[PDB]
Amino acid sequence: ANRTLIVTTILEEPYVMYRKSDKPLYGNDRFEGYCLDLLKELSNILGFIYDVKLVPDGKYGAQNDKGEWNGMVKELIDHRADLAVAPLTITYVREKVIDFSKPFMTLGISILYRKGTPIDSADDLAKQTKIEYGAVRDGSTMTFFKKSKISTYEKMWAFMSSRQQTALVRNSDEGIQRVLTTDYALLMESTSIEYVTQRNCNLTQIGGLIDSKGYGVGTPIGSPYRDKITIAILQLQEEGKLHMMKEKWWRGNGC
Ligand SMILES: N[C@@H](CCC(=O)O)C(=O)O
């Protein structure tokens, strides 16, 4: 009409999940989560309708050695989506190829590991080999270590990229499973660490935030919607709604 916006996203708890129901669920009704509530509110403010699709390869997006992007980032580059509404990290390398709204949530890389060990920081992980560590393949944390010029992070990258078949995981669910079943520490964004540690009293963040950043809504470069989505996010912040959405999905999870 009124064209239907195509939204690309990625299943990731509590941001985007399949809703569980006894009755059959069709289309957007199949999904729930922080990012779906946010999408609803954005569409309430900006007056659009949308069709939610998953990223075909189930990846956030990274650029390979040939310079090629994948994941949700590539979906925007190739104009197969109008918006990525996902816990999608705003980074300088991504900003060269796609546009981002202002952040709807802030976070930094930290460490997820079990409690009760002498590991207090990234340095404690870097100076040893017994405890394996790593990150989600082709996300921004993996890229942060790959591009880092800080020694300890450089040393950590050499370790994870040499052990990449085991050290790099396909998604955060696998990384948490590795932390649970095996001797492994996950480099993970702090908002997700928070979600996990609230649900398993054996797990903890180790050390503080290794960087500081945000999740934003992605659009193709030059999109007219990017600024409009910023304005809508600023209204939700002003209304306290970003706070209530976070509380809803983190502490009192679900509907
Ligand atoms: N939010 C990250 C994914 C998770 C991670 O890389 O730690 C991204 O946009 O790539």
Give the C-alpha distances (Å, rounded to integers) separating 47 from 41, 142, 229.
10, 36, 11
Same domain assignment for residues 251 and 169: no
Using CA positions, which residue lies closest to atom 6 of ligand 1? 139
Q: How far is the CA of 208 from the centre of ligand 1 (A)?
A: 17
Task: Based on the fold, state whether residues 222 and 156 are members of the same structural domain.
Answer: no
Q: 75 and 57 in one domain?
A: yes
Task: Give the atom of ligand 1 at the shortest distance from the alpha carbon of 62.
Answer: 10
- The count of domains in the chain is 2
Residue 127 C-alpha to ligand 1 middle, in angstroms? 25
**Residue 248 to residue 255: CA distance in whole angstroms:** 8
Quick one: which of 74, 71, 121, 86 has its CA closest to 16? 86
Convert 104-138 to b/e letters by CB count within 10 Å (16 or more is b). Answer: bbebbbbbbbbeeeebeebebbbeeeeebbbbbbb
Both 126 and 166 in a single domain? Answer: yes
Residue 105 gets the label, from left (phi > 0), alpha (psi -120 to 50) or beta, of beta
Q: Do both 26 and 145 map to the same domain?
A: no
Resolution (Å) of this entry: 2.0
Distance CA 124, CA 113 (A): 12
Q: Which residue(s) pair with 203 in the sheet?
A: 114
Same domain, 206 and 120: yes
* Ligand 1 environment, Cβ below 6 A: 60, 87-89, 135-136, 139-142, 188-189
Cα 23 to middle of ligand 1, angstroms: 33
Residue of 136, 112, 120 lying closest to 198 (CA atoms) = 112
Specify the CATH number for the domain of residue 155.
Answer: 3.40.190.10
Q: What six digits make up the tokens of 151?
A: 């020694």
88 CA distance to ligand 1 middle (Å): 6
Q: Both 155 and 141 in a single domain?
A: yes
The boundaries of the domain holding residue 203 are 108-212
Question: Would you say 212 is a known binding-site residue?
Answer: no
152 is in an annotated binding site: no
C-alpha–C-alpha distance, residues 182 and 132, integer Å: 9
- 35 and 55 fall within a common domain: yes
Contact 202, 117 (CB under 8 A): no
